[PDB]
Amino acid sequence: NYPAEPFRIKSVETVSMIPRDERLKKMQEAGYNTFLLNSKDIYIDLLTDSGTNAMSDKQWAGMMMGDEAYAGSENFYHLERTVQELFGFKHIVPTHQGRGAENLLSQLAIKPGQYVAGNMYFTTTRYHQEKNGAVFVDIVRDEAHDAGLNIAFKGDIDLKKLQKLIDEKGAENIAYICLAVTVNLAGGQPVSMANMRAVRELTAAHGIKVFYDATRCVENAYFIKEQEQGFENKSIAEIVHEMFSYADGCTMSGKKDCLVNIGGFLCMNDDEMFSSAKELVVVYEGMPSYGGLAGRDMEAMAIGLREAMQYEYIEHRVKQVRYLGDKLKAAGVPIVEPVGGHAVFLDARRFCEHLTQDEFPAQSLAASIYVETGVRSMERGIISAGRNNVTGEHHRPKLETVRLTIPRRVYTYAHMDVVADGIIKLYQHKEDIRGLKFIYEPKQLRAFTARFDYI
Amino acid sequence: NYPAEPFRIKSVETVSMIPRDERLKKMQEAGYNTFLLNSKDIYIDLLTDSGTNAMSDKQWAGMMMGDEAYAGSENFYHLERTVQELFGFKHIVPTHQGRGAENLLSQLAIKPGQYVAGNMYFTTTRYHQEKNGAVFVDIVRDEAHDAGLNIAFKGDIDLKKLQKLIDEKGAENIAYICLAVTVNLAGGQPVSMANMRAVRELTAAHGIKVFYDATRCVENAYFIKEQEQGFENKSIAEIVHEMFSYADGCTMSGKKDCLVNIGGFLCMNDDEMFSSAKELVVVYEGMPSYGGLAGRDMEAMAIGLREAMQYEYIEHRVKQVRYLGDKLKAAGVPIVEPVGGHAVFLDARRFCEHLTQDEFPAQSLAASIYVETGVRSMERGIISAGRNNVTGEHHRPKLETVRLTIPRRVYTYAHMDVVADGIIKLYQHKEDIRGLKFIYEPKQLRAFTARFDYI
Amino acid sequence: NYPAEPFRIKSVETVSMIPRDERLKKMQEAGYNTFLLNSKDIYIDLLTDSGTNAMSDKQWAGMMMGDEAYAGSENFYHLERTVQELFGFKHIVPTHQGRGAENLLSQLAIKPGQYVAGNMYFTTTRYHQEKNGAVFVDIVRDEAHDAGLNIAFKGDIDLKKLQKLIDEKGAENIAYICLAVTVNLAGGQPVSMANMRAVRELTAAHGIKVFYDATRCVENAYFIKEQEQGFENKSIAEIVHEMFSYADGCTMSGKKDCLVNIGGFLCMNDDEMFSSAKELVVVYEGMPSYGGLAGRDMEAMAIGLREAMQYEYIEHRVKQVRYLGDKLKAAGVPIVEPVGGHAVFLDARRFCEHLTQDEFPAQSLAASIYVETGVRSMERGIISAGRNNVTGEHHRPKLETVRLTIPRRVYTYAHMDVVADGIIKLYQHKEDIRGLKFIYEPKQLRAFTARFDYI
Amino acid sequence: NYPAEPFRIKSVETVSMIPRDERLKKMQEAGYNTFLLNSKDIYIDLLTDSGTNAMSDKQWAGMMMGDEAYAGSENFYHLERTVQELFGFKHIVPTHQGRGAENLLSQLAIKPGQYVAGNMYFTTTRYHQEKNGAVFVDIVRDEAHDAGLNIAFKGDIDLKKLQKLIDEKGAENIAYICLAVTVNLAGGQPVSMANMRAVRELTAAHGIKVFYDATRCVENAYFIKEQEQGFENKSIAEIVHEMFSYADGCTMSGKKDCLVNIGGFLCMNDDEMFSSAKELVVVYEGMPSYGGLAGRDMEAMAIGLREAMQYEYIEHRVKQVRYLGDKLKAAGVPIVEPVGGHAVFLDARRFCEHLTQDEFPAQSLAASIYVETGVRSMERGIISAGRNNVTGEHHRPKLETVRLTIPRRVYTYAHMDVVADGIIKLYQHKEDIRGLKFIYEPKQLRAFTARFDYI
Ligand SMILES: C=C(/N=C/c1c(COP(=O)(O)O)cnc(C)c1O)C(=O)O
Ligand SMILES: C=C(/N=C/c1c(COP(=O)(O)O)cnc(C)c1O)C(=O)O
Ligand SMILES: C=C(/N=C/c1c(COP(=O)(O)O)cnc(C)c1O)C(=O)O
Ligand SMILES: C=C(/N=C/c1c(COP(=O)(O)O)cnc(C)c1O)C(=O)O
Ligand SMILES: [K+]
Ligand SMILES: [K+]
Ligand SMILES: [K+]
Ligand SMILES: [K+]
Incomplete structure (x- = not known):
């Protein structure tokens, strides 16, 4: 049991x-x-x-192997290929934690006056969106705000609310969809793969980008394996990889599901946005090769993300x-x-x-x-x-x-x-x-x- | 509960x-x-x-502070003061583990032909006694040999068997009394403080030395605090200190109750025997200041022994x-x-x-x-x-x-x-x-x- | 030699x-x-x-003692007391590294249109100043721009240029004076204590605040002890404490003179500015009690700063x-x-x-x-x-x-x-x-x- | 230079x-x-x-991966295959340090009254030989006792002295030849490969076993590569492997050339002697699977021995x-x-x-x-x-x-x-x-x- x-x-x-x-x-x-x-x-x-997890002996072994170089650290290359393999995104930019990645994404993907819609919000995530000139719109299903209602995948986005936002505001006035897995504010509630697939199909038809808030994506993947039909035979890793195939990028706080005490990163597939991200990371976080993290912490995060699978x-x-x-x-x-x-x-x-x-x-x-x-x-x-x-x-x-x-x-x-x-x-x-x-x-x-x- | x-x-x-x-x-x-x-x-x-315990963050901090000097290591002095404070013995000699200390004690306190009596035996302990020419005599209470008998302090020495051994063989033919706490062979059974005091009083009257096998002395001290009347107000440390006040020395396997993965030591009060021990430890274990232990391990054992209290x-x-x-x-x-x-x-x-x-x-x-x-x-x-x-x-x-x-x-x-x-x-x-x-x-x-x- | x-x-x-x-x-x-x-x-x-230093055995012992709590970590209190003792400032806010502290200071102490003057500049420091609406003014001595000139304390501020800036623009249009120790761009050149005292006396008369860029303040303090007359009897710690007594606050990159691989902080004496800093640090770095740093890293930086003395x-x-x-x-x-x-x-x-x-x-x-x-x-x-x-x-x-x-x-x-x-x-x-x-x-x-x- | x-x-x-x-x-x-x-x-x-060496980051990573099991530890298997690969011996028995292995070898290979001959002696090595009933005979070349004589491979065994001992005492009265590399007492002087080869040829003709005191064998191998003709193109590892091909076993103190702070082992090729060694190690050192060492120390020693090559x-x-x-x-x-x-x-x-x-x-x-x-x-x-x-x-x-x-x-x-x-x-x-x-x-x-x- x-x-x-x-x-x-x-x-x-x-x-x-x-x-x-x-x-x-x-x-x-x-x-x-x-x-x-x-x-x-x-x-x-x-x-x-957040940041309170116990690391493993393997992670602590990595902590002794910190390559603290300012550029070209082996730990960065380890973290880079691990994220590319497990999440499937093209480009990775390390940050000291999740809100560092949110600061970067909000400055890269938001024009002042546009809308950002998502399944509820988090404090730092919504702050960087609004401070960069966006208006937040909650498009989670109404049931998610009802504490006592026991239904599965309470964190799903209401596709009808999404279609309503596109019709009333126009697709050009929507910066992106911010899909969180899991949904922290609703009680750590998961999002189904079908909802992620449906959001991707609707947004791609209007040319609207989708970026995940993926801090607790591994917990989300477990719920899919446990409760979503047709996934009981798929591994956690296969589910995680398929989840992000419906996104254009993500902000990640390693302090959650990467089983570390510090660390995060920003992922995306677009080459031009990745170029601008590397210009902006040197101002706030550090070099694109360490991004405000010690080498040993990039190493612990790379190992921890693999352990979470x-x-x-x-x-x-x-x-x-x-x-x-x-x-x-x-x-x-x-x-x-x-x-x-x-x-x-x-x-x-x-x-x-x-x-x-x-x-x-x-x-x-x-x-x-x-x-x-x-x-x-x-x-x-x-x-x-x-x-x-x-x-x-x-x-x-x-x-x-x-x-x-x-x-x-x-x-x-x-x-x-x-x-x-x-x-x-x-x-x-x-x-x-x-x-x-x-x-x-x-x-x-x-x-x-x-x-x-x-x- | x-x-x-x-x-x-x-x-x-x-x-x-x-x-x-x-x-x-x-x-x-x-x-x-x-x-x-x-x-x-x-x-x-x-x-x-034995040797399988999980260390604390404090012990691991000590592991980073190993003074690896061949003589005069700060870690040895830390271990020395801790044992003198907690056990009350005058002299301390580190050994790589318990059977290393038994090898030293058996060569120091046994003349070929003498008797060694104790509350049952352990394999390595009895071997070093017999290899140095001693005949082992079990003087445990008869109840200890009844596996199903649920009685307290099953490990106590039968004072009548001890008095019988002294009368039949003579005190000069008795090397020492080997009192183990706890008694491993009987299932980890404790020895009461009253039994320890009675053994000390009987042996001291005949000039017979008493040495403890203290590998699980802290577990023994808890049983005294839980089940022996008049000790419910005494701290574990106070009980441990009083236990060893009835002994002339001890062998210890830190790999048990010192919460470490390697380490042991030999204690005694006699100055002349401590001098011979420092000569003999260099042959089998190492210098009196490290005794077959890395500096970091003497530190971990010193910290762990205090944690066990x-x-x-x-x-x-x-x-x-x-x-x-x-x-x-x-x-x-x-x-x-x-x-x-x-x-x-x-x-x-x-x-x-x-x-x-x-x-x-x-x-x-x-x-x-x-x-x-x-x-x-x-x-x-x-x-x-x-x-x-x-x-x-x-x-x-x-x-x-x-x-x-x-x-x-x-x-x-x-x-x-x-x-x-x-x-x-x-x-x-x-x-x-x-x-x-x-x-x-x-x-x-x-x-x-x-x-x-x-x- | x-x-x-x-x-x-x-x-x-x-x-x-x-x-x-x-x-x-x-x-x-x-x-x-x-x-x-x-x-x-x-x-x-x-x-x-930057961030490439070798830590000590003591720092690594501290790394094993990370209190990874999200609020109220013992490591933060240790870091807090160390900076208050060694630097003399009232309030301390940790940041993941130096440019994180610069981001906070620039948003707190700059109104759009004001001037920021200092002894040359650094890339990240000047960017956060200019991005928040300030115009940078170099007030270093003219000799600092002569690469071959072998003279002492090349990083001193030209007091006449400072007096000229105050007269032409007015003290109300000057955000603060940014005094860096040492001056990286001029080759790591030190600033004399006499120059620091003269800047403090001139700015205090006009109500102008002074904030230090102290990333290499310990190297600066050594140059004072070696080459400034009247300081050969002062300890490094005494010199450091006197240096910051002429400032209202500082930004620090622990990755330099704190002998760590990650870490920084922001200091100030003003209570109201410290209150706004605690509100702003949660958006970009983290809680005022960890500020984008793991607990173990606040501990390592606290130990390292004391070692640098x-x-x-x-x-x-x-x-x-x-x-x-x-x-x-x-x-x-x-x-x-x-x-x-x-x-x-x-x-x-x-x-x-x-x-x-x-x-x-x-x-x-x-x-x-x-x-x-x-x-x-x-x-x-x-x-x-x-x-x-x-x-x-x-x-x-x-x-x-x-x-x-x-x-x-x-x-x-x-x-x-x-x-x-x-x-x-x-x-x-x-x-x-x-x-x-x-x-x-x-x-x-x-x-x-x-x-x-x-x- | x-x-x-x-x-x-x-x-x-x-x-x-x-x-x-x-x-x-x-x-x-x-x-x-x-x-x-x-x-x-x-x-x-x-x-x-001895035991005072600085370990590497790789060794310290291994220290975090201690498998502290009493039997079947992964660290023991790592150490076992590393020694089998690098030294070429069939069987390995770990010990807490070198004199622990000497205690085992002297009890296994010496009959009371036999002779043990070698190139000078060390204190613990000679003690265990003499305490087990052997008479030590120095067969080093006379030049080795002359401090000022600057000749190469001063530690070589005088083959003429060896032949003289066999003729006067008989091969059956010689327990073994104890060949040390390097020779500590003569100033850390190396032994040539030709001398090792000549000793093996002479002893094998009389059925006399040869066991190395190999604590500084890597330093010895460097001298061969530097100064012995025909070895300037061979790697250190190839030289080390060939050195031990002329021995029936060895006693090793990892505290020297294995770059660790504690640890040693006993090697041999003979199956029957290996069986008796495992019986004796449980009495003095510990189980044949850890031999008085923590798992992490077997790991550090296995890594360090490979680094020394x-x-x-x-x-x-x-x-x-x-x-x-x-x-x-x-x-x-x-x-x-x-x-x-x-x-x-x-x-x-x-x-x-x-x-x-x-x-x-x-x-x-x-x-x-x-x-x-x-x-x-x-x-x-x-x-x-x-x-x-x-x-x-x-x-x-x-x-x-x-x-x-x-x-x-x-x-x-x-x-x-x-x-x-x-x-x-x-x-x-x-x-x-x-x-x-x-x-x-x-x-x-x-x-x-x-x-x-x-x-
Ligand atoms: C710290 C928390 N949250 C962090 C968080 C963050 C920010 O991550 P960092 O704490 O790594 O900046 C972003 N998105 C979500 C959904 C989050 O839950 C918390 O839930 O206590
Ligand atoms: C190894 C075990 N006991 C070791 C032991 C020893 C030997 O200690 P070392 O294993 O530290 O040599 C000594 N005395 C007692 C009572 C012991 O139980 C065991 O019970 O598995
Ligand atoms: C990275 C370097 N300097 C960083 C730096 C910084 C930025 O600190 P962080 O790198 O800790 O953000 C701030 N102030 C000064 C004077 C600096 O020199 C460097 O010189 O390579
Ligand atoms: C401790 C030293 N020698 C150790 C040693 C030993 C004994 O090794 P342990 O110290 O590891 O027991 C054996 N053989 C030789 C040639 C040695 O030099 C020393 O030279 O200070
Ligand atoms: K943390
Ligand atoms: K670094
Ligand atoms: K040592
Ligand atoms: K162990």
Whole structure:
């Protein structure tokens, strides 16, 4: 049902298990914002799966073989051919992480005033699109915004919404389609191969380019192998390669599915766009031959991307997350369904039904979770959504969630039991969670540095 | 009941998950002898807890700080202060592993014709004693020889047998008392502090020296804290320090409870014996300042010994083994009781009651365990007992067992579930396990290179 | 005269020692462009001192202690305290490398239309200034533009030019003064403490902010200790701390004087500007607590910055470069004088006086240097100067040089002898060096991908 | 003339350069015995080339790939095939270092009362021979004991002395011939291929086995390629393979020419002796599949042995030692000639002509060298020779030397200049070196723990 880890523990990381009362002052010191907690004070850190993964002995062997040359590093050539082989794109430009590649793509493929449409958004991805003069349009299926609706491939793009955008705005006013795999904001929800194929057929007929946000593409490929009909016999690698055959390029954060702690890259097939990308990367990231990464990190990322193609690795990765979700569901704890590839999202609206969204139930549930359990989680609700620029009012998302994000190969099922058991106990007296309000709020990107206080 | 790992995974070790049919071919290639399997073909390797432990990030940081000098290495001084602080002995001599220290002690403290008495024996320990002209005398309590008897501190020395040996032979004819903690041969059974204090009081009255075999002393200290009355307020470190206060010295295999992959040492308080030890260590191991160890390994062992004192680490270590034993016992699988600190012993005589001991049931059970699960275990029965050279007959031990030995910090509860589930499944059709016979048998130490075939 | 290395070799890097005939074929495969050579084909790689340094055993111990948390990593706090202690600034924001910090500073401290003045410029630094709407003004002393003039502290700012800029434009139209230490473009020339104090006094009277480009600040501090009167009793650390006391902030490329292969940061004292920096860093680099760096790399940079303060390290570093310059000068090889802190610049115009600048003498000298020695050097002449886009004409710099850039702690004096001996041998038959012409030329940044053939 | 290092520095080791007065008290604390100095107090540690080598990036990559299994480790298989390929022996048994293999060989191949003859001796090698009942006979050419005689292949066995031993004692009373390459005690002097071939032809005619002490066999192979006629076109590997084709086995210390910090092995071709060796290794070292070594160390040793076959590596290694010898010779400093492969031996008899051998000039010169220069060297004279057991009097060797032993890939020519310059200055007032006498002397192996005082 739930497989054992398809690896052994090679080395362990020291942790501290501090008491509740000490956790209280830290939570107070952090303004009740888990983003402001210190790593050393956290038993199980589920803030994000980005850059928090455990590497393998093979990757660490590569770390000893860093060719740190400014140009022509063997590690770059290794990373280049690995991505060309596994993703199938013609050209690769390394970047220090995913948002470095997003900065490049948005400056290369967007004219001021054009539209960029995709299946929901991510913060840095949407920022670089809008800062380069684009207007974002969400074309995900309406079901993806419904936390409790348990349907497969919730991250699919609504082809009808896409056709509507092309007819009303014109294909020439659409910069590109930004297709994310998986869809982080909807709970790590996958996109079917049929949806990727249908988007490619519709966009190619209008000459509209398609670029993937591929940070969690391997988790996406597992869902296709598990649940999409006709792919149960295909390997993860074959599925990944076919996924990108429907794209003109991609932005990749190795910090997710490449099983590394730093790194990303930009891929594309177009020769002219690749030329302009190499001109722009030297300004922000570095040389086209290292792009803001040490040689050893290009090596670790090349090895890690190949490791992620092992079926047993990715099956266990996803099913460990599912185990935490299943234990929570069995105790009646409200969660986003179905469980995504990288995290379980607690539905703070149902968890904190005594609070309104103006009282920030997700931010307060995350604070309560750490104090009561020593687990750090991330607010993914009204605080992260920001304020509408025209009216200065809160954006009001249907998804008011607390994200329990699982780094790859770091924790065990017993750690998941600690998390689930603590949340299930907290759910018993959920009425005790107090509301929050801003005591400090920045002008932009308030989720990371804002401070709150109770009631 | 069973605690989560008090650490997270820093790095993982690649394994191959070959299916049953391939595991069968590997087992046939190995002549149905788990000792002849290749490490690369094994999912979960429970052959031994010696030298197989996962190190911490701190230990690996120390590995980068190796002072490789031939004399006066900083790593040796670090190791020296740590052992003097934690064990309380005056003098420390490093050795490449435990049997290196036993070679030194046996040559220093034994006159040809003297007696060495202890709570059972280990193979290498008793060999160095007998090769230097000593006759071994078992003075363990009679209960230790009852595999099914579930009683505490089974490893205690019978004080009456000790008093009997002193009266019959004289104190001048007794080289030393060899007190092992824990007792490996009885299943990893602990020794109480009260027994250690009584042995020290009786030997000191007759001027008899006492030297500990302390390879699993930390596991022993946990049993004292858990089960001996009056020690529930003492730290692991306090218990360890008090244990060795009743000894004149010790031999240690760091490859066990020091959480390293290589290393050991010899301790003593006597100045003159320490002087002779420094002369003898240069012949067999190396300088008194490295003793057959790289500098980085003295550092890793010094750091690891201090890590082993953390209560949460050793509690989880012992309870992970107990978890495997409890799950097997709950399904009716016959095991040695009580479960020891480092391993679970399957009673292969009861498990394969349809086979005679001449058909090697423990060897054949270990073979089936690997084929059905990818778990390697060790035969501890008639094969390891060897053949009598004078008569050419099997030595026939009362204990016909398969040893599931758990390396420290390498596996999870899910891995223990893989082991237990496979063994329980085999137990439900145990009548199908076929006997084995020699197709190749060496003249000595047949457990390591013999090959078999089914009957 | 020239000190031995104040360290020993802990580990070595494998190189290939291919003979001249193979090096020729590699050079032809690279189109006679050293930027297109593969690292694996190079014996001594003097392309740059950026990111190519050898780390210490202590830094590598830190690499094993990476706290990879997304927020609140212990490595960030270690880096934070180190910079606050050594540089004296209030606030620190990590970036993946120096140009990442320049991107942040240029967006924070520049209004469109303002002026930025400094002691010459660097490519990435001036680009971020000009892309945010600033006009660059060179206020370096006129002597800095005289390649052959051997005078001290060639990088000082001409206070009269600064006073002239303030009077003509007004202090409100000056974004900040950008003082680089050292000055890379002039050959790595230092700035005196007296010049730093005078700039601070003049700018503070007009309310003009001063930000340092401190990538090679430690090399600069050594020159002050060696050659500025009244500092021979001050430690390197004391000099560094006093240098930054005359600045409101800095951008740093740890890839230079922090003895690492990746990393940088942004410093400032203003609280409000630090708040805006934390909002902007999440868009381009990452969280204020890691800023596009792995935790292990923040640790390595924190350790490396403290190591750079050791007098013996930086003395040997600078004198190793000086050794190469002295040996070349003693044989009559024309070089830029005085020798800078990090590189020796060959005067290719004088070296290949039989060739015109349209025949690319610096590019061709670099080619011959690799073929004859296996040493890679960088063209810093007409090719790197680029082509004017409006007229399609070569930009023609007065400096037509080949840069021998020395990574820190990577090479020995014997390696410098290989470099010098080969160049001196080439100089004895310099008339044989043939000119080059484009067989391929990209539209921009031609230095990195252009290919040539002999004339 | 003297080649540059055929590698780059990947990582550096921190050193301390403490003043003379502090060095004095340490030398006093150590009883004027350099063996008792602390590593942390030494700038350049030339005590020994054993276990002090710098590893490569490839070796350190292997260190991350330790397969720590007790049996069937991939690292053992790597080491096994590498030795079989490069040395040509049938069977390999790993040991923790060379003297572990010597303990095994001496117990396997010696009957009490037999003779073991060889080209001089080493301490641990001769101890295991004599402790197993053999009488040592030196059959090296008489010239090898003359420090100043500069002849090639000084380590050759005198075939006439060998024939004399066979005629007087009988071939049945000769256990084996112990042929060392190189000969450490004579100054690291090589053995010609012709001498190895002649010894094999003479011993095989009498059925006498030949076993090599091969710790520095690669240095030996370089001398053959450099100076023996007909081998200047053969690779180092071909020479090494042919060397061992004249032996029945070997004892190897990886700590020398395998470029590692720990490790050794025993090789042989005989099946029956290999069987007995595997029985004996489990008692002293460990399993035949790891033999007292961590898996990662078997991996590093396998890689290092292959690296030592690179001509440029071993040429530079030997010529760096020769450079130190040439600088000393040019200043008139008396040394053993010719310079050996691994060390320069100062001739303390000529250096301290005002002292008799009873005043221990070599021990006192080593003390003076450290105090005046911060360089540690080893006494190789009357102190190491020991006392004659029959008369209780000093053994009086013709060679009274101070050994400046060079670890592989650790130091530069500039470090050699520091050593040479300091010794040359000390030679100017050599009359100031005071004699020493025992204030403490052990019964055996006095060189390592004895303490002395002046006059
Ligand atoms: C850091 C996170 N996300 C990163 C991310 C990024 C940016 O990648 P970097 O963090 O590697 O810049 C882009 N696209 C998606 C969908 C992402 O989820 C997170 O989910 O916590
Ligand atoms: C190898 C094992 N035991 C080794 C051992 C040793 C030998 O230690 P080394 O393996 O470190 O020599 C000494 N004393 C006891 C009680 C031991 O159990 C084992 O149980 O598999
Ligand atoms: C890459 C080089 N310089 C980079 C540099 C940079 C850019 O730093 P990063 O390369 O760390 O972005 C900034 N400031 C100065 C003065 C620099 O010299 C070089 O000289 O090869
Ligand atoms: C340690 C040294 N010698 C080791 C050695 C050995 C012993 O090797 P281990 O140090 O690896 O035991 C054997 N044979 C020779 C010729 C040796 O030189 C030394 O020369 O300092
Ligand atoms: K990270
Ligand atoms: K680099
Ligand atoms: K060593
Ligand atoms: K091991």
